[PDB]
Design a protein around this motif. Structure first.
Motif, PDB file in Angstrom:
ATOM      1  N   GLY A   1      -1.043  15.413  21.596  1.00  0.00           N
ATOM      2  CA  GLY A   1      -2.335  15.653  21.127  1.00  0.00           C
ATOM      3  C   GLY A   1      -2.825  14.492  20.872  1.00  0.00           C
ATOM      4  O   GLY A   1      -2.455  13.554  21.383  1.00  0.00           O
ATOM      5  N   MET A   2      -3.970  14.399  19.777  1.00  0.00           N
ATOM      6  CA  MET A   2      -4.634  13.002  19.670  1.00  0.00           C
ATOM      7  C   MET A   2      -4.499  12.802  18.183  1.00  0.00           C
ATOM      8  O   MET A   2      -4.896  11.868  17.417  1.00  0.00           O
ATOM      9  CB  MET A   2      -6.227  13.251  19.799  1.00  0.00           C
ATOM     10  N   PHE A   3      -3.410  13.336  17.710  1.00  0.00           N
ATOM     11  CA  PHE A   3      -2.758  13.361  16.121  1.00  0.00           C
ATOM     12  C   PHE A   3      -1.605  12.897  16.058  1.00  0.00           C
ATOM     13  O   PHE A   3      -0.628  13.259  16.812  1.00  0.00           O
ATOM     14  CB  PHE A   3      -3.073  14.729  15.495  1.00  0.00           C
ATOM     15  N   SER A   4      -1.181  12.250  14.945  1.00  0.00           N
ATOM     16  CA  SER A   4      -0.005  11.754  14.727  1.00  0.00           C
ATOM     17  C   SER A   4       0.479  10.718  13.496  1.00  0.00           C
ATOM     18  O   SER A   4      -0.542  10.006  13.067  1.00  0.00           O
ATOM     19  CB  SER A   4       0.697  11.032  15.888  1.00  0.00           C
ATOM     20  N   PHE A   5       1.370  11.162  12.816  1.00  0.00           N
ATOM     21  CA  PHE A   5       1.624  10.572  11.275  1.00  0.00           C
ATOM     22  C   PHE A   5       2.591   9.345  11.788  1.00  0.00           C
ATOM     23  O   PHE A   5       3.477   9.147  12.777  1.00  0.00           O
ATOM     24  CB  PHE A   5       1.709  11.382  10.441  1.00  0.00           C
ATOM     25  N   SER A   6       2.630   8.409  10.879  1.00  0.00           N
ATOM     26  CA  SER A   6       3.388   7.202  10.899  1.00  0.00           C
ATOM     27  C   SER A   6       4.177   6.802   9.642  1.00  0.00           C
ATOM     28  O   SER A   6       3.848   7.519   8.428  1.00  0.00           O
ATOM     29  CB  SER A   6       2.319   6.060  11.234  1.00  0.00           C
ATOM     30  N   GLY A   7       4.951   5.717   9.501  1.00  0.00           N
ATOM     31  CA  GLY A   7       5.694   5.408   8.262  1.00  0.00           C
ATOM     32  C   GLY A   7       5.010   4.445   7.478  1.00  0.00           C
ATOM     33  O   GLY A   7       5.366   3.491   6.808  1.00  0.00           O
ATOM     34  N   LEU A   8       3.819   4.934   6.890  1.00  0.00           N
ATOM     35  CA  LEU A   8       2.954   4.147   6.019  1.00  0.00           C
ATOM     36  C   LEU A   8       3.096   5.137   4.825  1.00  0.00           C
ATOM     37  O   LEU A   8       2.186   5.838   4.596  1.00  0.00           O
ATOM     38  CB  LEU A   8       1.648   4.129   6.634  1.00  0.00           C
ATOM     39  N   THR A   9       4.122   4.710   3.814  1.00  0.00           N
ATOM     40  CA  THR A   9       4.069   5.501   2.612  1.00  0.00           C
ATOM     41  C   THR A   9       2.536   5.212   1.860  1.00  0.00           C
ATOM     42  O   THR A   9       2.577   4.383   1.452  1.00  0.00           O
ATOM     43  CB  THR A   9       5.178   5.874   1.476  1.00  0.00           C
ATOM     44  N   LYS A  10       1.736   5.922   2.363  1.00  0.00           N
ATOM     45  CA  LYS A  10       0.251   5.861   1.772  1.00  0.00           C
ATOM     46  C   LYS A  10       0.031   4.601   1.614  1.00  0.00           C
ATOM     47  O   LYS A  10      -0.989   4.021   2.426  1.00  0.00           O
ATOM     48  CB  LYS A  10       0.210   6.665   0.469  1.00  0.00           C
ATOM     49  N   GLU A  11       0.473   4.243   0.351  1.00  0.00           N
ATOM     50  CA  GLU A  11       0.304   2.904  -0.258  1.00  0.00           C
ATOM     51  C   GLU A  11      -0.027   1.774   1.004  1.00  0.00           C
ATOM     52  O   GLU A  11      -0.593   0.543   0.866  1.00  0.00           O
ATOM     53  CB  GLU A  11       1.592   2.530  -0.899  1.00  0.00           C
ATOM     54  N   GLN A  12       0.638   1.934   2.079  1.00  0.00           N
ATOM     55  CA  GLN A  12       0.554   0.987   3.341  1.00  0.00           C
ATOM     56  C   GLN A  12      -0.816   1.099   4.108  1.00  0.00           C
ATOM     57  O   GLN A  12      -1.472   0.232   4.525  1.00  0.00           O
ATOM     58  CB  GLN A  12       1.655   1.475   4.289  1.00  0.00           C
ATOM     59  N   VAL A  13      -1.369   2.160   3.887  1.00  0.00           N
ATOM     60  CA  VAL A  13      -2.602   2.756   4.239  1.00  0.00           C
ATOM     61  C   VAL A  13      -3.862   2.550   2.920  1.00  0.00           C
ATOM     62  O   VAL A  13      -4.583   2.778   3.704  1.00  0.00           O
ATOM     63  CB  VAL A  13      -2.598   4.116   4.616  1.00  0.00           C
ATOM     64  N   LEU A  14      -3.484   2.518   1.847  1.00  0.00           N
ATOM     65  CA  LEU A  14      -4.629   2.571   0.828  1.00  0.00           C
ATOM     66  C   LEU A  14      -5.158   1.120   1.058  1.00  0.00           C
ATOM     67  O   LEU A  14      -6.242   0.716   1.232  1.00  0.00           O
ATOM     68  CB  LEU A  14      -4.155   2.615  -0.686  1.00  0.00           C
ATOM     69  N   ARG A  15      -4.117   0.552   1.488  1.00  0.00           N
ATOM     70  CA  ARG A  15      -3.927  -1.015   2.062  1.00  0.00           C
ATOM     71  C   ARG A  15      -4.886  -1.394   3.126  1.00  0.00           C
ATOM     72  O   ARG A  15      -5.847  -2.212   2.872  1.00  0.00           O
ATOM     73  CB  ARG A  15      -2.605  -1.171   2.647  1.00  0.00           C
ATOM     74  N   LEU A  16      -4.867  -0.806   4.259  1.00  0.00           N
ATOM     75  CA  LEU A  16      -5.766  -1.020   5.430  1.00  0.00           C
ATOM     76  C   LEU A  16      -7.121  -1.058   5.104  1.00  0.00           C
ATOM     77  O   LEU A  16      -8.077  -2.063   5.488  1.00  0.00           O
ATOM     78  CB  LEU A  16      -5.632   0.131   6.428  1.00  0.00           C
ATOM     79  N   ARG A  17      -7.861  -0.167   4.467  1.00  0.00           N
ATOM     80  CA  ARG A  17      -9.205   0.061   3.973  1.00  0.00           C
ATOM     81  C   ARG A  17      -9.479  -1.335   3.743  1.00  0.00           C
ATOM     82  O   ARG A  17     -10.633  -1.933   4.244  1.00  0.00           O
ATOM     83  CB  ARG A  17      -8.751   0.784   2.876  1.00  0.00           C
ATOM     84  N   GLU A  18      -8.816  -2.284   2.832  1.00  0.00           N
ATOM     85  CA  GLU A  18      -9.001  -3.596   2.398  1.00  0.00           C
ATOM     86  C   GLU A  18      -9.579  -4.562   3.249  1.00  0.00           C
ATOM     87  O   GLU A  18     -10.873  -4.463   3.607  1.00  0.00           O
ATOM     88  CB  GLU A  18      -7.315  -4.048   2.072  1.00  0.00           C
ATOM     89  N   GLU A  19      -9.061  -5.871   3.018  1.00  0.00           N
ATOM     90  CA  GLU A  19      -9.806  -7.011   3.629  1.00  0.00           C
ATOM     91  C   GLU A  19      -8.931  -6.989   4.809  1.00  0.00           C
ATOM     92  O   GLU A  19      -8.196  -7.919   5.509  1.00  0.00           O
ATOM     93  CB  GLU A  19      -9.720  -8.254   2.837  1.00  0.00           C
ATOM     94  N   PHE A  20      -8.887  -5.872   5.367  1.00  0.00           N
ATOM     95  CA  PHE A  20      -8.462  -4.956   6.683  1.00  0.00           C
ATOM     96  C   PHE A  20      -9.785  -4.374   7.100  1.00  0.00           C
ATOM     97  O   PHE A  20     -10.528  -5.127   7.329  1.00  0.00           O
ATOM     98  CB  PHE A  20      -7.228  -4.225   7.151  1.00  0.00           C
ATOM     99  N   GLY A  21      -9.810  -3.116   7.218  1.00  0.00           N
ATOM    100  CA  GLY A  21     -11.354  -2.186   7.324  1.00  0.00           C
ATOM    101  C   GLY A  21     -10.760  -1.418   8.491  1.00  0.00           C
ATOM    102  O   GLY A  21     -11.259  -0.984   9.274  1.00  0.00           O
ATOM    103  N   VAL A  22      -9.384  -0.779   8.021  1.00  0.00           N
ATOM    104  CA  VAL A  22      -8.905   0.002   9.014  1.00  0.00           C
ATOM    105  C   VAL A  22      -8.979   1.255   7.838  1.00  0.00           C
ATOM    106  O   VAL A  22      -9.018   1.164   6.773  1.00  0.00           O
ATOM    107  CB  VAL A  22      -7.768  -0.401   9.762  1.00  0.00           C
ATOM    108  N   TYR A  23      -9.283   2.507   8.472  1.00  0.00           N
ATOM    109  CA  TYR A  23      -9.475   3.764   7.678  1.00  0.00           C
ATOM    110  C   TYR A  23      -8.573   4.776   8.219  1.00  0.00           C
ATOM    111  O   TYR A  23      -8.773   5.583   9.298  1.00  0.00           O
ATOM    112  CB  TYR A  23     -10.801   3.950   7.882  1.00  0.00           C
ATOM    113  N   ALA A  24      -7.355   5.040   7.752  1.00  0.00           N
ATOM    114  CA  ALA A  24      -6.309   6.290   8.089  1.00  0.00           C
ATOM    115  C   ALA A  24      -6.657   7.592   7.230  1.00  0.00           C
ATOM    116  O   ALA A  24      -7.806   7.741   6.824  1.00  0.00           O
ATOM    117  CB  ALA A  24      -4.996   5.726   7.505  1.00  0.00           C
ATOM    118  N   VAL A  25      -5.557   8.452   6.975  1.00  0.00           N
ATOM    119  CA  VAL A  25      -5.911   9.560   6.237  1.00  0.00           C
ATOM    120  C   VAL A  25      -4.849   9.692   5.114  1.00  0.00           C
ATOM    121  O   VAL A  25      -4.799  11.105   4.840  1.00  0.00           O
ATOM    122  CB  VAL A  25      -6.030  10.753   7.183  1.00  0.00           C
ATOM    123  N   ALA A  26      -4.404   8.808   4.763  1.00  0.00           N
ATOM    124  CA  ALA A  26      -3.738   9.017   3.315  1.00  0.00           C
ATOM    125  C   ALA A  26      -2.714  10.138   3.231  1.00  0.00           C
ATOM    126  O   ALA A  26      -2.528  10.990   2.380  1.00  0.00           O
ATOM    127  CB  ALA A  26      -4.448   8.905   2.191  1.00  0.00           C
TER     128      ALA A  26
END
Ligand SMILES: Cc1ncc(COP(=O)(O)O)c(CN)c1O
Ligand SMILES: Cc1ncc(COP(=O)(O)O)c(CN)c1O
Lengths: 396, 396
Positions: B346-371
Motif C-alpha cells: 500500500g502507500m501506508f506504513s508505521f515505524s519505530g518512532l515512539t510518537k515522541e520521535q515524531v513530535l520531534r520531526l515537526r521541530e527544527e526539522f519540518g517533517v510531518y508524521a501522524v503521531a
C-alpha cells in the motif's frame, strides 16, 4: 442474517414512476414529477453551468479531497443569498454553512447534529408534507409532529389550525418551515404571517428548521429570503437547509448546504465543530462537482446574468402556465372556481380529486397524478393543456 | 439551545494538516497525507477521466435526479471488478450495489441498513484502524470492537492475537476486513491466511464487512479481489463497501458503492429494498458526476487502457519508492532492518518512532508524521528521499 424475514417497500414516489410509460400511449404525463420540464418536457442542463463545466475541464488542476464544509464561496453566496447581501450578520460572523449533498441530504446532517449539542427530541413538520421529511427526521430517533394548515376547500392556509396545532408543544422542540410555498401546496404565510409566528417562534420557544429547496423559483427570488429574514433579525438560533437542485439544473450531483447561526462567533465556531462531525461519519466530505459549478455561476456577473435569466424564465411558466390550466377549464370543466391554482405558487398544488378521482386518470385516460391530489404544474404544457384539461371532466 | 455548553474537537487528521506549511520552510512533507502525489507532489486529475469529463460536457443532455442506486454500469463493473468477471454469482443474480458518496460514506449506509433488517449490535474492527471507522460505526449506536494483528517489532501480522482476539465474540456480530493491506499498515493475511479465517468467518458465524478503498492500488489489481473472493464462494452473506477515490483521481466528488449479496435473488432484492431506504434519508440519491466518469472509463477499452496504465504507474512508485526509503537508510541511518517497509504494501506504513520521535520531526526539522508512526510513502520522493532520510537519524 441480512437474509431472512425482512420487510421491504415503496417510497410513495414510484407512485407513477415507471408504471407511467408502462402500458404505452398518450400518457398526458405523470403530473407527479420530481422536476421542472419545458414546453417540450425535457429537464435540460441549462448552459450557465455548462458554461462553467468547461471552465473546470479547463482548470481543474487536481481533484483532491474537499474539506468537510465544501467551499465557502459556495458558502458565502449561499450565506449572502439566504440571510441576504448586506447583513453584517454576515460580518457579525454568526452563521456558517457546510457543503452538503443537497436538500434531503442536509436535513439529515441536521438530525444527528441536533441529536447531539441540542437536547431536542422532536420536529413538528406540516400537514401535508414531503414524505422523506418524517423519514430523515426519524434518523436520530427524533419523531416528527404534524402542525396543520391547508385545511382545504378554499385550498388556502389555516393560520388557525396552525398557530394552534402549533403553539401546542414544548419549548425545546423543533418546527420545520419551508421557505416560501410548499410541496404539495404552493401556499404560504404572507409577510405579516411569517411576521406573525416568529413573535411566536420566540417566546413560545421553538427554533426554526427551514427547508429551502425551490428557493427563489416560486417567487421572483426576493419575497423568498424575506420569508426567512423576517424571522431572522428576530431570532437568535436557527438551522437552514438549502438546495440548488432545481433552481439550477443541478441534482444527480447533490447540491445545497446546511447553515448554522447563533449570537456568538464563539457559539457557532463551536456548534459547527461538532456539526462537522455529523457529516464526517456520513459521506466524509462533499460531492464537489456541484459546489464549484454553483460558486462559479454565482461569482460571475456575465455568467450570473445568464443563470438569472434562466431562472426568471423558469418562473415565467409557473406564474404563466399556472394561469392556463385555469382558463381552459373556464372553457370546458366548469364545476368550480379553480382560481386558487393560478395564484397559489411554486410548481406544486393539490386539487379536489378525492384520490379515487385520480386512481381514475391512470385509466383509459393515461393521466398520472400523486394520489394526494398533487400535480407538478411543471409537467403541464401548451400541448398537454388541452387533453389534460379534458382528461378530468369525466373524473369531475 | 444549539448554543451553550457544547463540547467540540479534532479528527486526528488535522494532525499536521495546515500546521504543516504554518511556520514556513523546507517542510519535508506532512508524510501523513490523505493522498498519493508525484515526484512533484501534485495530486493530479489523471486524463482517462478528463478524457471523459469532455464526453459528458458533450452529451449531458439533462441532469435529472439519479435513482437512489446510482447507475449499475457503475454497478455492473463495480460488481464484475469485485467478485470478479466470470462469476455467474453475477448471474446468479445475487449481489446488488447502490451508488454511494465514496468510502466512509458507504460504510455508514451499511450501519443503518444494518441497524434494521440485521439484528446486529456490533462491529469488530482491527487495531490499528481508520479512525472514522469507529465513528461511522457508532452511528446506529452499534459499538465497535478491536480484534488485533500488527503486534509490532517485526512489524508483521499477529495471526495469533487475531484468530484469538477474533474468535472471541458472538455469532450475530460484524467483523470489518479491508481488502488487501491496510491503513496504517500495508500488511496482510496472505492467500492461505485469508483462506484461514473464512473457514472461521463461517462456522464461528461472523459475516464480513470489507472496506475496499485502495483496491488494486496496493497490489497489481489482482491479488486484490482474491483477498475478497477467496472469502466469497465460501460465504452466503456479506457487505462490501468500495471507493474509486484514489485509484482514480476521484474524491472531492464522492465515488464508490455499497454491495449487498445473499443466496437468493429473492433475499437480496428484499434486503436491498430496505437498504435503498438508509440512503433515502441521508443524501436522497447519489453525487452522479462520479459514477459516470467511472462507468465510462470502465466501459471503454481505449479509455480503460489509458486508466489502467495510469493505475499501474501509480503502483510502480509504492513498489518502487518503498524500496528507496530503505537503501538510503542502508546508507545513513543504520540502526535496524527497515526491510519491512519495502515489502509491506500500500502507500501506508508505521515505524519505530515512539510518537515522541515524531513530535520531534515537526521541530527544527519540518517533517510531518501522524503521531502513530504512520507515513504516506506516497509523500516520499526522489528529491525528499535524501533530507527525510537524514531528518530521522538524530531522532534515531
Ligand atoms: C420540501 C423538500 N425538501 C427537500 C427536498 C430535497 O431535494 P434536493 O435534495 O434535490 O434538493 C425536496 C425535493 N423537491 C423537497 O421538496
Ligand atoms: C480504510 C479506509 N476506509 C474508507 C476510506 C474512505 O475514503 P473515500 O471516502 O475517499 O474512499 C478510507 C480513506 N483513505 C480508508 O482509508
Amino acid at each position: 442474517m441480512f437474509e431472512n424475514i425482512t420487510a421491504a417497500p415503496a417510497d410513495p414516489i414510484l407512485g407513477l414512476a415507471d408504471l407511467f410509460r408502462a402500458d404505452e400511449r398518450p400518457g398526458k404525463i405523470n403530473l407527479g414529477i420530481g422536476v421542472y420540464k419545458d414546453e417540450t418536457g425535457k429537464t435540460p442542463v441549462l448552459t450557465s453551468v455548462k458554461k462553467a463545466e468547461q471552465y473546470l475541464l479547463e482548470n481543474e488542476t487536481t481533484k483532491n479531497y474537499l474539506g468537510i464544509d465544501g467551499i465557502p464561496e459556495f458558502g458565502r453566496c449561499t450565506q449572502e443569498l439566504l440571510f441576504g447581501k448586506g447583513s453584517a450578520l454576515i460580518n457579525d460572523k454568526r452563521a456558517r454553512t457546510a457543503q452538503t449533498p443537497g436538500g434531503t441530504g442536509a436535513l439529515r446532517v441536521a438530525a444527528d447534529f441536533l441529536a447531539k449539542n441540542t437536547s431536542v427530541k422532536r420536529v413538528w413538520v406540516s400537514n401535508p408534507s414531503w414524505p422523506n421529511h418524517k423519514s430523515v427526521f426519524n434518523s436520530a430517533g427524533l419523531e416528527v409532529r404534524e402542525y396543520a394548515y391547508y385545511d382545504a376547500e378554499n385550498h388556502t392556509l389555516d393560520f388557525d389550525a396552525l398557530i394552534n396545532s402549533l403553539n401546542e408543544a414544548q419549548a425545546g422542540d423543533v418546527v420545520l418551515f419551508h421557505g416560501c410555498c410548499h410541496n404539495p401546496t404552493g401556499i404560504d404565510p404572507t409577510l405579516e404571517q411569517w411576521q406573525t409566528l416568529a413573535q411566536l417562534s420566540v417566546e413560545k420557544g421553538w427554533l426554526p428548521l427551514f427547508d429551502f429547496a425551490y428557493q427563489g423559483f416560486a417567487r421572483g427570488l426576493e419575497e423568498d429570503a424575506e420569508g426567512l429574514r423576517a424571522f431572522a433579525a428576530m431570532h437568535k438560533e436557527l438551522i437552514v437547509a438549502s438546495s440548488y437542485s432545481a433552481n439550477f439544473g443541478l441534482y444527480n450531483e447533490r447540491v445545497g448546504a446546511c447553515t448554522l447561526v447563533a449570537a456568538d462567533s464563539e457559539t457557532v465556531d463551536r456548534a459547527f465543530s461538532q456539526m462537522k462531525a455529523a457529516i464526517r461519519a456520513n459521506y466524509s466530505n462533499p460531492p464537489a462537482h456541484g459546489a464549484s459549478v454553483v460558486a462559479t455561476i454565482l461569482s460571475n456577473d456575465a455568467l450570473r446574468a445568464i443563470w438569472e435569466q434562466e431562472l426568471t424564465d423558469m418562473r415565467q411558466r409557473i406564474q404563466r402556465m399556472r394561469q392556463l390550466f385555469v382558463n381552459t377549464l373556464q372553457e370546458k370543466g366548469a364545476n368550480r372556481d379553480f382560481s386558487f391554482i393560478i395564484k397559489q405558487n411554486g410548481m406544486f398544488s393539490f386539487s379536489g380529486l378525492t384520490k379515487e378521482q385520480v386512481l381514475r386518470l391512470r385509466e383509459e385516460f393515461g393521466v398520472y397524478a400523486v394520489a394526494s391530489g398533487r400535480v407538478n404544474v411543471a409537467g403541464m404544457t401548451p400541448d398537454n393543456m388541452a387533453p389534460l384539461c379534458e382528461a378530468i371532466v369525466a373524473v369531475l
